Amino acid sequence: SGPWRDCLQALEDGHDTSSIYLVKPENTNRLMQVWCDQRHDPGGWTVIQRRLDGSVNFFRNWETYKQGFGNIDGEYWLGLENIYWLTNQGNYKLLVTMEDWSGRKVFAEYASFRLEPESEYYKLRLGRYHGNAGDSFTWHNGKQFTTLDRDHDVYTGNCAHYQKGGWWYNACAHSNLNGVWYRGGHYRSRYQDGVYWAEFRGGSYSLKKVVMMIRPNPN
Ligand SMILES: [Ca+2]
């Protein structure tokens, strides 16, 4: 309590309880609330996205993805502008944790994760992968962000109209973590628009719980 540059700075001053914290990145006056996961190894994780229970609508427009939406103690998207300022104050790694409907938990980690500015459509910059979920994000490396009202992908249509999220769509997605949460995992739709990570359970399986979290990775 009392704004922190990120969840790691809060942890370093003794707040090791996972909860809601106030964050203000360096070199900005941008204040935000975040959920800090201070338990997952090694602590200091700032949650930028979380799916858990289908309570929040992720089929949203650009301004909503820019500013952030959802419930900070539940499902939410932190906001492209907030994520930009966070990821540009140092080198941050990205950890994606995922759980299927049978209790299996896997992860994908990227040693660097940065977004370009809104002037560059929040283009994704991703570093090297390790994990046991398989790498379904690197296909999206270098792609701009796309929403239902702003097409910036390399598909001749708008991928958000089909995959139903806001995402760094290519043509269209190997991961669709801002897609439609389907109870029970297995689903069938005209288009694969679920919360999927293709290398783990494929495009027709919606993951029960997903977290995208970031933390300084200084080297
Ligand atoms: Ca397009």
Side-chain angles (χ1 to χ4, degrees), residues 1-189 191-219:
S1 323
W4 312 99
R5 55 178 281 282
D6 56 37
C7 290
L8 182 55
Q9 195 181 51
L11 181 62
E12 287 178 344
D13 214 56
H15 309 101
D16 56 358
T17 304
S18 292
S19 188
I20 306 168
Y21 291 79
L22 297 165
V23 161
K24 186 196 85 54
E26 272 151 350
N27 293 314
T28 199
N29 285 340
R30 184 138 193 118
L31 189 81
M32 71 190 80
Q33 72 184 181
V34 309
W35 186 273
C36 292
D37 184 337
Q38 309 291 48
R39 296 288 101 172
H40 193 102
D41 176 52
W45 293 99
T46 306
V47 170
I48 68 175
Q49 189 260 22
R50 186 164 52 207
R51 310 302 291 279
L52 315 148
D53 60 15
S55 59
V56 171
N57 175 21
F58 275 73
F59 190 33
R60 311 293 276 277
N61 64 23
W62 181 269
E63 177 65 10
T64 302
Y65 267 100
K66 180 182 175 174
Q67 297 302 334
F69 61 92
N71 304 305
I72 202 74
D73 60 348
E75 303 194 321
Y76 77 90
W77 171 258
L78 182 62
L80 292 157
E81 190 66 8
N82 287 337
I83 293 157
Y84 167 79
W85 288 111
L86 279 166
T87 60
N88 278 261
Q89 76 186 336
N91 182 63
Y92 280 74
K93 62 180 159 181
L94 170 72
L95 171 57
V96 184
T97 64
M98 296 164 267
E99 185 179 341
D100 74 7
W101 285 83
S102 292
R104 303 182 180 85
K105 314 164 182 52
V106 294
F107 77 97
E109 189 172 288
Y110 301 84
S112 67
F113 168 78
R114 188 172 62 82
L115 300 189
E116 302 196 350
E118 188 180 24
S119 61
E120 298 297 319
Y121 308 142
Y122 294 118
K123 179 190 281 191
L124 172 68
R125 305 301 289 285
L126 264 177
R128 293 294 85 50
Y129 155 91
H130 83 278
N132 59 9
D135 182 4
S136 286
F137 206 25
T138 294
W139 194 52
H140 297 273
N141 189 26
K143 296 317 175 202
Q144 295 156 338
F145 205 79
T146 282
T147 58
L148 56 94
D149 60 333
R150 289 194 57 174
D151 179 354
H152 297 306
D153 62 35
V154 299
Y155 169 50
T156 38
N158 185 329
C159 285
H161 297 170
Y162 298 94
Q163 273 58 61
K164 297 290 202 307
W167 202 245
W168 304 271
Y169 288 119
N170 189 331
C172 279
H174 287 179
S175 54
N176 194 42
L177 300 189
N178 288 336
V180 177
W181 189 92
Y182 286 95
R183 191 178 317 271
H186 301 278
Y187 77 98
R188 183 121 193 249
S189 173
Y191 298 100
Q192 291 183 133
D193 56 9
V195 178
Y196 67 78
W197 187 272
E199 288 307 311
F200 176 30
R201 308 281 325 249
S204 288
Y205 189 96
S206 178
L207 300 169
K208 181 184 190 184
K209 295 178 183 158
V210 175
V211 182
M212 308 180 72
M213 33 176 37
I214 63 175
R215 186 191 180 281
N217 188 21
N219 294 287

